[PDB]
Design a binder for this molecule. Structure first.
Ligand SMILES: Cc1cc2nc3c(=O)[nH]c(=O)nc-3n(C[C@H](O)[C@H](O)[C@H](O)COP(=O)(O)OP(=O)(O)OC[C@H]3O[C@@H](n4cnc5c(N)ncnc54)[C@H](O)[C@@H]3O)c2cc1C
Ligand code: SF4
Ligand code: SF4
Ligand code: SF4
Ligand code: SF4
Ligand code: SF4
Ligand code: SF4
Ligand code: SF4
Ligand code: SF4
Ligand code: SF4
Ligand code: SF4
Ligand code: SF4
Ligand code: SF4
Ligand code: SF4
Ligand code: SF4
Ligand code: FES
Lengths: 189, 79, 77, 296, 662, 137, 252, 95
């Protein structure tokens, strides 16, 4: 932690673990507050959220730690953490927080910022592709069409699987935010 | 002053809950009828209980014992 | 609040058991619904006006299940 | 006969069509009329799509809402995740003006406006309400007792939580869904940590399948210990997790449970006399045949 | 009239926002103004000397001071005006600091100067029309009332009585003592609570200057600082004290506390003193150390079987037909000491308080651990009666909580009493371990930090994490406590045999009704409000009423007793003098303008107005003692027949006219 | 050439305390309102308001305690009824009734007092000079 | 005189003995009464908080809570001084409202806001944006040129060491009995507590009177307290001292 | 963390991270107290030790965490930690 040596393994081993005031990103905090629509700066680290999380007992995921990073503005610590995608959004933390914070909403805002900086698992991008193509995250297939027919339902549900003219409107909605143009670019690699 | 509930889904309009209720039978079958109000009347094929505010029933069970395909549940506990 | 005056009213088979828990002291007013006859000589006599009378004919004929001949407010007893 | 637009998201029509078929039939048997939604799509699934972009989540949920707005009807749902998306975006855009404005100028590119005129209901919520079909009406409609079956309920998370954002009451130990299973004649059993997430929410099902399956396996262990013969659920996500994930648990781990997973609408159909073939119970990974032997 | 205008700088607090020279020159050119002048600190002795010299030299009729707020410095400048040969009430202030300078500091100077000139003009216009008032002095009845028989009420009553004032001690329950009588041991010294309090209970019971009235409530209060006509409800105790028995004619006596009545009573009900854990008959005492050992009868649960009277025999202490008697008592001052109750923690469903057997709260734990409680002092599990070996303490249970269910404040003593209970279990059950799930241990008082050190030394485990939820094991009835160890950085699952919730405290039941009877307001927190939060924590805004104890906010027994003696001193101040001066803001009816319509009579909350006969004409009559100076009646009367003494219509209208003068 | 003339009549026990608290906390607001300070708002007679408006108040503000928080148990209910009736009279004599309002400011709401000051100033500035000053002639 | 009331108050514990916080050796390290005089509008400055080293306005201010308190090493005091968490919150608010854009860092170890409206005050300070770092300060280093202070501790909740560089460091020092208080209480015959404060007759039920009759305690001299508690204690002592004077007799 | 699967990589990935009362070794704590001759059970986790450590800013070594493990009896967590040998015994924490 003396300085930068430019030997990557030694830089990884002797990374400065010490928090400085140069590490705080108030812009990151303000973006999180705006997007999450929650009073996240009011956490006093009681640990109820982590005590209620179902992901915590089997991983290194700590929602209280993510709340602390949000409060201190530790962008590039929160966003690059691979345990940002282990939240099931079960809302137990939000159900129990004594300060009326929505830590899962803070997690959602963090995930949006991570996507905007191009950190995102591939299942999310594949779901974007599927919804762009057919409007359905879990689309129909031939075997289910046969099963529906044997039941007595129409071979396709009344959705955009049977009314393909609304797919164009869905595609314009997605294209307005450029979600497809980012998902395909990130997938290409 | 109890509460009776009629399962409209399996009521056939048999009218044996109307004929057998001893509060319905007060008007025409009593000397000097006292009260002429009626718990049930079969409107549109199912038994309707006019006794909305649960003032006339006496938990007799003549109507529960009468319906051929059990469809009248008698509640003996305060509504 | 406070919990230990635990008032419970359980229908154990054919006996309606009305209870008041403490740590070590209980109180069990037990009504045997096979012997009750639907008279009110238990409601007229109650000094504390808790016992009320229910669907006597239905219960005594077997056509009522969710009630006994008499209801006792075990919080007032 | 109350009439509702039937949203019908992705998993029920495309993986478990018996769920939607029984939904329509049983809802019609009780006093409810479920009308098809015209060109509805994926409710932008709250985890896998809300994690990516909240603004497009809002826009797609609002489009789904304005379809039924033009229909002039109240949405009825059968999925907790779809409930989250549809109902919560409806609630947020009924009160937040700048978000209304943003969504409206996004939707104006497709000649379509959100005004906030309808309400969103879960089908089990309707079955429980007293104005609409109540527990007593469900008991009346039941024609096959389904007696002598131990059935474990999974509430899910997006229907009831957070309780500061919903209106279903206590989240620590609710009993309302246990009353609907008791109406059918099956005895609902209680298991340890019954309010635990199934593990499939938030996109974890896709991102880390082993993590999600461990969360699911904790539940399956508790349910087997209680002694359940089936798991009722009110969510096609949770049904997919409890159904596929039993197979993936059998292969990735060495655990065998063979516990059938059924939607409450499928159990209601079984109670009201629908056939297993008409419910398409052959489309589940886990065979329902032991449960059918018990309740038939 | 001749008015002097004195403009304070407040040491640049005002001169740094306006032009004091310009304000002074404008005051000089104003009409009626004899002298206008300025000084750096008009509230200081040279400032009062300046006022007095100006009065003497210029023969001033009235004084206007352009300075800070009247609510801060009316008494100062009224006394300065008196010393100088004027009436105190020929004085008027113009608030040009807290309403001109501090709010128009930045970038706007001539605007603040114009505002100051306007305020000075309005003040001069009012003061040119003020005239002489003399404050009303009213006699003070030499008795006092203390509502509440807890430690704070008993301390206040003993203090007043030993100062010599006759005192009434009203307690709703059949015994004095309060919560401290329920406590088993006390932090931070570990003394037995009853042992330290019984001496003081005996003093209260024996004091000749204390009229101890237990099992009695306050129906209604009317009056003021002078005489409070307090009506008391003497609830039907059902049993006669020896004095009352002799008065009624029974020579053999009344109740001697033998216990035969409760030995034969067949009714059995929960004991509220033991938080419901223990049985008590229909005729009963809370505990064996109650101060009036007189054996109340619980008429809501008595069946009038008459066995108790046969057991009592010739003593004839039991009167089963007794009814609520009403008494009216005149008192000079009143002290409110209503205490507190535990917040209902069953609303927090994640901690299964009512739904799991082995989850209790801290007063039930204190009764279970006391040697006089339902158990023989042996802590046992409610579920099966077995001795626990692991006990958890959930601190902050319902406190510092902004979700709308719990309380947003700290209850002050719950960290300390949880430490006491951890010590008690670790010393009473050998090998038992105490786990405290805490979020800011708050040991702030004298010897509290040392107590905390000693508890950690004896070996309590301190886990810094607020409990998330509690699950009950289906078979052993053990409780699985789930939280995170925030310092360790991992989730935890601690399985305990007994869980104790350190619940928040809230104002007692009926306390809001009583404080509305007495005219006291409430705080943001919901506790009774004090006159000034810093420099007057005992008195209230309504004169003659004082606060003592937890009723004003949660506190330990030391702080409660200090507050109680402070309140007793404040209540003794006017009784020892015997006079008290009221503020001469009363309504005065001008009879040869009153038409006798009687419509104003119903506009007085204090019933100070009535219709009476004067010179044949029916006119309105003001009870000047009962009037409080609000002005509702005088703002109503269409004919202008009611005059408000320092805020008369001509004065207020002169202020309005001066504002619009240009 | 024109500056609004707004007059406030604030009770001693909550509105004067709130204004004092705002000053102590150093909350800035424009210097357009001048206050009178009566004991309760029950003291405020209708003729005070009407006299202000006929002398030429571009606006009038009456500030008192919240309902249930009057120092004198119920003196602001009387004031509220009186000001409702004053709103009706000004509307029917054809003067703009939004020149008058009654706010309930507690003793601890210095921020709310500042916001009330700002909003009253803004509303009167939008409304413009009162018509009485030219209708008199 | 008939009775006597002792109200000698308190002084700040000498915090220059704790050498790791360079109180006397670094210019820009002050204590809480010096900060209160610097922030008062009647103080040496015009109410403007400026750095002692160069007279420039600080933009980052650190508050070392527990400075010399709850300390069993023999240098500091083993007790809590009661009001230092509250006054540090007040000072953080004052700097954040008086210097625009200034940030307050509180290095704390158990925030103790126990009194009436104290928790709400704590909530409001956090809302206005004071940073609360749960870690007792380990040591303080002074930058040789800018005279800035490098505060070294661990963020115990975050789980990492920290190095916060502030322009001004304020020590919330412990309080101790005033100078000469022991001499005066020996003149009057009063004993001392374990803590070193004057002792009361009964710690629970008589916090004002002493064992020597006719002498009563009031204020911080009996133990640290806020102005509300001090005034309640003072009036209690006045009442106790009036009890024998009003009677005029007293029995030995 | 559901149970033991006996697939070593999955056991490593889903190791139970949750502290139980079965994890405490009071014998380990008593041995530490005896050998160290210090009052280690009296730590209240102020963080001064870690704030003064020269090894902490460049590694995962946390002396306060080791003190917490000692207090809670986490044998096999303290002993097997490879950052047990990064203490230079500079005695700043003790100071
Ligand atoms: C579990 C627990 C443990 C505690 N342990 C300690 C400890 O170890 N040490 C310590 O110092 N403090 C302790 N405390 C705090 C202590 O109990 C209080 O400081 C103290 O009891 C305050 O007494 P009080 O007289 O103000 O109120 P209370 O003791 O509540 O007395 C109020 C009295 O007024 C009566 N009353 C109420 N309303 C009316 C009415 N309308 N009319 C007439 N009478 C009325 C009540 O019946 C009661 O008798 C503990 C508190 C709890 C909850
Ligand atoms: S529960 Fe709320 S207050 Fe507690 S640590 Fe989590 S976010 Fe912070
Ligand atoms: S919402 Fe996410 S962080 Fe909160 S408890 Fe559920 S999984 Fe944990
Ligand atoms: S129970 Fe008897 S009285 Fe009541 S409705 Fe039936 S037949 Fe009539
Ligand atoms: S007897 Fe039964 S079936 Fe016939 S009308 Fe009555 S309820 Fe219906
Ligand atoms: S009704 Fe009452 S009195 Fe009659 S038999 Fe039953 S219990 Fe006895
Ligand atoms: S009278 Fe008021 S304005 Fe003048 S110096 Fe004193 S405090 Fe300041
Ligand atoms: S028997 Fe009579 S004297 Fe004895 S305790 Fe009972 S009431 Fe009192
Ligand atoms: S009358 Fe009977 S019930 Fe009442 S107290 Fe006496 S013995 Fe008990
Ligand atoms: S005193 Fe302690 S336990 Fe009680 S509310 Fe305050 S911090 Fe929590
Ligand atoms: S003072 Fe006025 S309101 Fe009162 S009676 Fe006389 S005329 Fe009527
Ligand atoms: S001013 Fe009038 S209404 Fe108010 S208290 Fe006095 S007499 Fe009553
Ligand atoms: S009051 Fe706060 S800062 Fe002062 S010694 Fe106690 S805990 Fe430390
Ligand atoms: S061992 Fe470390 S964390 Fe524990 S008290 Fe000492 S310095 Fe603080
Ligand atoms: S001795 Fe030195 S290196 Fe070892 S823990 Fe202490 S400060 Fe760190
Ligand atoms: S005291 Fe302010 S409105 Fe009455």
């Amino acid at each position: 932690a003396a300085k930068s040596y430019n030997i990557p393994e030694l830089d990884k081993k002797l990374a400065d673990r010490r928090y400085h005031l140069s590490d705080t990103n108030p812009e990151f905090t303000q973006k999180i507050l705006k997007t999450s629509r929650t009073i996240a700066n009011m956490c006093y680290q009681c640990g109820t959220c982590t005590g209620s999380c179902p992901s915590a007992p089997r991983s290194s995921y700590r929602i209280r730690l993510f709340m602390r990073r949000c409060v201190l503005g530790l962008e590039n610590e929160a966003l690059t953490d691979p345990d940002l995608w282990l939240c099931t959004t079960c809302y137990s933390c939000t159900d129990r927080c004594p300060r009326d914070i929505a830590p899962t909403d803070v997690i959602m805002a963090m995930r949006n910022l991570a996507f905007k900086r191009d950190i995102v698992p591939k299942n999310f991008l594949q779901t974007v592709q599927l919804i762009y193509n057919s409007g359905h995250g879990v689309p129909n297939n031939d075997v289910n069409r046969a099963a529906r027919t044997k039941l007595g339902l129409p071979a396709d549900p009344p959705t955009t699987h049977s009314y393909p003219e609304f797919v164009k409107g869905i595609q314009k909605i997605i294209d307005h935010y450029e979600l497809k143009e980012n998902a395909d670019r990130i997938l290409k690699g | 002053a109890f509460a009776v509930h009629v399962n409209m889904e399996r009521c056939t309009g048999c009218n044996n809950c109307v004929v057998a209720c001893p509060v319905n039978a007060l008007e025409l079958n009593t000397v000097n009828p006292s009260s002429t109000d009626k718990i049930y009347k079969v409107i549109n094929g199912d038994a309707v209980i006019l006794d909305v505010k649960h003032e006339l029933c006496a938990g007799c069970g003549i109507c529960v014992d009468a319906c051929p395909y059990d469809v009248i549940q008698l509640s003996g506990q305060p509504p | 609040s406070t919990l230990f005056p635990k008032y419970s009213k359980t229908t154990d088979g054919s006996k309606v058991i009305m209870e008041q828990r403490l740590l070590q002291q209980v109180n069990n007013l037990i009504l045997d619904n096979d012997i009750c006859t639907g008279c009110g000589i238990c409601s007229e006599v109650c000094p504390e006006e808790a016992i009320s009378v229910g669907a006597v004919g239905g219960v005594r004929r077997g056509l009522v299940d969710d009630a006994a001949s008499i209801h006792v407010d075990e919080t007032k007893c | 006969m109350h009439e509702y637009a039937f949203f019908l998201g992705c998993i029920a029509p495309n993986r478990y069509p018996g769920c939607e078929a029984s939904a329509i039939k049983t809802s019609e048997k009780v006093g409810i009329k479920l009308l098809p939604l015209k060109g509805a799509s994926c409710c932008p699934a709250p985890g896998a799509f809300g994690s990516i972009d909240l603004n497009v989540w809002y826009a797609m949920a609002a489009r789904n809402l304005v379809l039924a707005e033009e229909m002039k009807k109240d949405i009825a749902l059968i999925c907790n995740g779809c409930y989250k998306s549809i109902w919560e975006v409806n609630h947020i855009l009924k009160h937040n003006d700048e978000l209304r404005d943003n969504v409206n100028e996004v939707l104006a590119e497709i000649d379509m406006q959100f005004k906030g005129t309808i309400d969103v209901w879960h089908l089990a919520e309707l079955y429980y309400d007293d104005k609409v079909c109540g527990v007593q009406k469900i008991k009346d409609s039941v024609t096959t007792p389904l007696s002598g079956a131990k059935v474990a309920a999974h509430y899910g998370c997006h229907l009831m939580k957070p309780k500061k954002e919903r209106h279903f009451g206590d989240t620590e130990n609710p009993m309302w869904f246990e009353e609907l299973i008791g109406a059918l004649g099956a005895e609902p059993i209680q298991y340890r940590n019954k309010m635990q997430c199934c593990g499939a929410g938030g996109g974890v099902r896709g991102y880390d399948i082993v993590h999600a399956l461990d969360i699911t396996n904790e539940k399956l262990i508790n349910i087997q210990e209680a002694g359940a013969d089936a798991i009722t659920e009110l969510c096609p996500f949770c049904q997919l997790q409890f159904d596929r994930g039993q197979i993936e648990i059998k292969e990735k781990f060495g655990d065998v449970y063979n516990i059938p997973v059924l939607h409450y609408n499928e159990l209601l159909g079984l109670a009201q006399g629908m056939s297993p073939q008409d419910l398409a119970l052959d489309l589940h990974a886990i065979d329902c045949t032991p449960f059918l032997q018990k309740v038939l | 009239p001749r008015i002097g205008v004195f403009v304070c700088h407040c040491g640049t607090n005002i001169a740094g926002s306006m032009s004091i020279d310009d304000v002074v020159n404008y005051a000089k050119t104003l009409p009626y103004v004899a002298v206008a002048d300025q000084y750096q600190y008009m509230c200081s002795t040279p400032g009062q000397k300046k006022i007095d010299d100006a009065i003497k030299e210029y023969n001033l009729t009235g004084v206007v001071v352009a300075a800070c707020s009247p609510r801060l410095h009316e008494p100062t400048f009224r006394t300065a005006t008196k010393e100088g040969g004027l009436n105190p009430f020929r004085f008027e202030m113009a608030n040009i600091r807290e309403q001109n300078s501090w709010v128009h500091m930045h970038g706007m100077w001539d605007e603040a100067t114009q505002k100051a000139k306007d305020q000075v003009r309005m003040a001069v216009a009012k003061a040119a029309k003020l005239e002489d008032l003399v404050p009303k002095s009213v006699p003070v009845e030499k008795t006092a009332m203390v509502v509440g028989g807890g430690v704070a009420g008993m301390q206040a009553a003993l203090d007043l009585a030993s100062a010599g004032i006759k005192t009434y001690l009203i307690e709703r329950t059949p015994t004095i003592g309060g919560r401290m009588s329920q406590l088993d041991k006390t932090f931070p010294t570990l003394d037995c609570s009853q042992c330290i309090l019984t001496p003081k209970m005996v003093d209260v019971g024996r004091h000749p200057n204390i009229e101890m009235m237990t099992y009695t409530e306050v129906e209604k209060v009317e009056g003021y600082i002078g005489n409070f006509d307090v009506t008391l409800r003497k609830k039907a105790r059902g049993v006669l004290t020896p004095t009352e028995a002799t008065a009624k004619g029974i020579v053999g006596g009344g109740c001697n506390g033998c216990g035969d009545c409760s030995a034969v009573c067949p009714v059995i009900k929960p004991n509220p003193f033991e938080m419901g854990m223990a049985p008590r008959k229909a005729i009963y005492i809370y505990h064996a150390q109650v101060m009036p050992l007189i054996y109340t009868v619980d008429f809501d649960s008595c069946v009038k079987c008459g066995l108790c009277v046969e057991a009592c025999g010739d003593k004839k202490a039991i009167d089963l037909e007794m009814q609520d008697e009403f008494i009216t008592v005149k008192v000079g001052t009143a002290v409110l000491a209503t205490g507190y109750e535990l917040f209902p923690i069953e609303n927090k469903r994640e901690w299964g308080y009512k739904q799991f057997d082995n989850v209790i709260n801290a007063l039930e734990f204190e009764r279970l651990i006391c040697a006089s409680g339902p158990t023989g002092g042996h802590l046992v599990r409610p579920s099966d009666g077995k001795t626990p070996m692991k006990v958890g303490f959930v601190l902050c249970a319902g406190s510092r909580d902004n979700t709308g269910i719990g309380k947003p404040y700290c209850s002050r003593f719950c960290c300390m009493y949880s430490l006491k209970h951890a010590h008690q279990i670790m010393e009473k059950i050998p090998g038992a371990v105490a786990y405290l799930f805490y979020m800011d241990i708050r040991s702030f008082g004298k010897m509290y930090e040392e107590f905390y050190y000693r508890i950690q030394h004896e070996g309590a485990k301190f886990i810094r994490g607020r409990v998330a939820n509690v699950l009950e094991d289906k078979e052993t009835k053990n409780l699985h406590v789930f939280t995170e160890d925030t310092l360790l950085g991992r989730p935890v699952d601690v399985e305990v045999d007994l869980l104790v919730l350190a619940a928040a405290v809230q104002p007692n039941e009926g306390a809001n009704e009583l404080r509305k009877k007495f005219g006291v307001s409430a705080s943001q927190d919901g506790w009774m409000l004090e006159a000034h939060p810093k420099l007057n924590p005992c008195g209230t805004t309504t004169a003659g009423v004082f606060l003592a104890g937890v009723c004003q906010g949660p506190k330990d027994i030391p702080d409660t007793v200090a507050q109680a003696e402070g309140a007793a001193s404040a209540a003794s101040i006017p009784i020892h003098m015997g006079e008290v001066e009221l503020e001469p803001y009363f309504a005065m009816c001008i009879d040869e303008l009153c038409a006798g319509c009687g419509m104003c009579v119903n506009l007085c909350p204090y019933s100070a107005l009535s219709l009476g006969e004067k010179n044949g004409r029916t006119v309105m009559v003001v009870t000047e003692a009962k009037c409080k100076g609000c002005g509702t009646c005088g703002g109503f009367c269409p004919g202008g027949a009611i005059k408000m003494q320092h805020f008369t219509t001509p004065q207020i209208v002169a202020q309005i006219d001066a504002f619009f003068a240009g | 050439d024109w500056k609004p003339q707004i007059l406030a009549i604030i009770c001693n026990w909550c509105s004067y305390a709130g204004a004092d608290l705002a000053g102590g906390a150093r909350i800035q607001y424009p210097p357009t309102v001048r206050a009178i300070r009566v004991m309760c708002t029950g003291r405020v007679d209708m003729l005070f308001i009407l006299k202000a408006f006929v002398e030429g108040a571009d606006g009038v503000l009456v500030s008192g305690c919240h309902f249930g928080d009057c120092h004198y148990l119920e003196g602001n209910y009387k004031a509220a009824k009186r000001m409702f009736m004053i709103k009706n009279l000004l509307r029917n004599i054809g003067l703009d009734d939004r020149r008058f309002r009654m706010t309930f400011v507690s003793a601890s709401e210095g921020a709310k007092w500042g916001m009330v000051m700002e909003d009253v100033t803004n509303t009167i500035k939008e409304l413009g000079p009162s018509p009485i000053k030219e209708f008199k002639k």
